Symmetry: C4
Subunit: 45 residues, 4 copies
């Protein structure tokens, strides 16, 4: 699950995923990919 | 498939999965993850 | 995709999968697991 | 996601996948498998 720092981080992320992989986009937009089903408090978006 | 020892093991497991991975939670709640589609007799819940 | 030699191979396979993994069951029931979406002519069931 | 050079590349690809794996077919039909959700401009089909 993709968890982001901000809404801007979300856009950037949803839009990167068209062309890029999960990890490339995660790193580029400043988003995290968790194991659980819930998104951390620091990456709500 | 996640198989648990007790109902308490289930709660603990369903609630751990928000934040934690499969294996961390499996170990912590005293649940097992099988290959088949059916849950062992010892881990029904 | 699970492809079997006979209907008996299918039963044995669908019933093994409750308790066992894919490969254990494949080998035990005399079924094959293909990459494609179509099942070989020799393993129709 | 499977992206192809031409419609012919698509047919060849959809029809190979019955019997063959992803990568074998990708290579044989002259199609690419991307990470993103969007297909490159050079492999639209």
């Amino acid at each position: 699950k993709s968890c982001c720092r901000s809404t801007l981080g979300r856009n950037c992320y949803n839009l990167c995923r068209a062309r890029g992989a999960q990890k490339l986009c995660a790193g580029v937009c400043r988003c995290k990919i968790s194991s659980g089903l819930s998104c951390p408090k620091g990456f709500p978006k």
